[PDB]
From a paper:
As reported for both human coronavirus 229E [name] and SARS-[name], PEDV-[name] is a homodimer containing three domains in each monomer. The active site of PEDV-[name], which contains a catalytic dyad formed from residues Cys144 and His41, is located in a cleft between domains I and II.
In this study, we report the expression, purification, crystallization, and X-ray structure of PEDV-[name] in its unbound state to 2.10 Å. PEDV-[name] crystallized in space group P212121 as a dimer in the asymmetric unit. The presence of different solvent molecules in each of the active sites of the dimer supports the assignment of one biological dimer in the asymmetric unit. The LSQ superposition of 229E-[name] and PEDV-[name] shows that the overall architectures of both the 229E-[name] and PEDV-[name] active sites in their unbound states are structurally very similar, and the active site residues of the catalytic dyad, residues Cys144 and His41 in both PEDV-[name] and 229E-[name], are located in almost identical structural space within the active site cavity, which is solvent exposed on one side. The S2 loop forms the outer boundary of the S2 binding pocket and shows positional variability across the X-ray structures of 229E-, FIPV-, and PEDV-[name], which may lead to differences in the size of the S2 subsites across [name]’s.
Residue numbers in the entry:
A (entry chain B), B (entry chain A): 1 to 301
The structure:
Amino acid sequence: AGLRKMAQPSGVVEKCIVRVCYGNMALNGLWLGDTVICPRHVIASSTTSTIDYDYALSVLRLHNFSISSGNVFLGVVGVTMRGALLQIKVNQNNVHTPKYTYRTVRPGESFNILACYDGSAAGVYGVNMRSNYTIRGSFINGACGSPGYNINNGTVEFCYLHQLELGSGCHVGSDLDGVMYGGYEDQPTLQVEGASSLFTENVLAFLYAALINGSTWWLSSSRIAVDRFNEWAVHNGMTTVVNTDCFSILAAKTGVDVQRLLASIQSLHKNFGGKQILGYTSLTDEFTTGEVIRQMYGVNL
Amino acid sequence: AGLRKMAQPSGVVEKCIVRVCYGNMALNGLWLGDTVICPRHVIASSTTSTIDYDYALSVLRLHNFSISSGNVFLGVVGVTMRGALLQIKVNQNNVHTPKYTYRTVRPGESFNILACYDGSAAGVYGVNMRSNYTIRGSFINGACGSPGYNINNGTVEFCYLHQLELGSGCHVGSDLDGVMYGGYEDQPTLQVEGASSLFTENVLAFLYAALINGSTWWLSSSRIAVDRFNEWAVHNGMTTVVNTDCFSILAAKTGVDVQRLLASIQSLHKNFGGKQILGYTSLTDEFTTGEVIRQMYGVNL
């Protein structure tokens, strides 16, 4: 029973976390093999309304870098830059490097955040990439470099390195190829979050978990076809539906089709009335179909 | 910015999880030093029905215990029962045993759950102890023995060992001294759940966090005396507030007093009804004042 936004265990990722310092900057890096990865703004000036990374790199001294894993200092061999990241060759292999890949997360997808400060993990929590390519994180100053990832068995799948905070307080990172998510800039300017929509396919996922837990009071007696819901969605701040059938298992075990849930969704936005749905905004899109199926039955999506 | 129900990093605890098998039956155990601690229904009848634990115990053989830390089977030298736990002595001292301690949590306090299956960590998430000594967790079959803990500056503070799920989906565990939270029984017996009530203290903490984060639609134009609130609260499944102190810093920074928040809580109770507070269900009481101060300012108590 139960449904929790959870993280997967952080042990394997905690071992790769390092403290990178340069000039007036300190943040967190990822140490994999003999390369250390961190946000390039570690080499910026903290006082300019603007960062000239080209300048900053041109005039860089390797002996101004302070990088550590625990109390052990790693020696800087040299630096390369890619997108919003530095890739720092160091003189030591991290023996604790797990098997890993890189992936860029798509909107509506979940992953873990390991929130780091001074090169060590402080908290771990699950998030979901929003349609405006931000996440609703929890971060205070010094968090830059905090990694996001999923663990697929197996392999650590890195998807996020924490870069900045928008004016609304939601946050943005880059993938590990250095591409900023949503096209934002790694500049100290206060940038702005664009319009987002509840990710409908995840709302559906959430409803099924709720039925399965005996949350029923919201359940509509009526039903509504998929595209006719879609035309309502695009002008009601909710995303359209494409994955027809990742709900087959759920629909079958509840005997509640998708159209019925779509009807319930439409009813639920116009608000109430009653209260709880396990919790949970009543209408959250933080849970993917994969997640829900897993906490319901413990199975590879 | 941001507020997230998170977990502390689980690395130090993951290396203490083991598979505990008597026969026959299977669950998770905690391997500290040369002791394995696990729930005692591991020896109990494979589910039909009630457990005469003295009978089960008198008849027990140590070699009917297979205990695997991942790959290695541990060898059982002896066993002692404490409340609803078994403490099993083994051949070897868990090399990675952290500095630890036991503590029993009070209703309305938060801690971490490390959800284990087959003797190893699969998920981690933060919870808060409800006033009827249960927690709203996320477990499915195989989860018994999953530890709950707080990490206080290096020291792992063990406060919870998962024992059972009630008819409601509530979860019940014992402290690491074998004491069943809330007086429940580690029995396959039909069992009832006490009446709970939201911790107003925690709700306040949350609402103050919302303000600090510039979520301010929900905020009342009105005040209500603390006394008057307390009268209403006991008819509406909310705890009374009797100490104002722990909100001074927050009232300071926002300029907004608790009596104004109290009026807001009443108003939100008769629902709201359009959309989120920091991502949640208008209200939640899963956050303490300490939790909130911590994620806002990175500072304790």
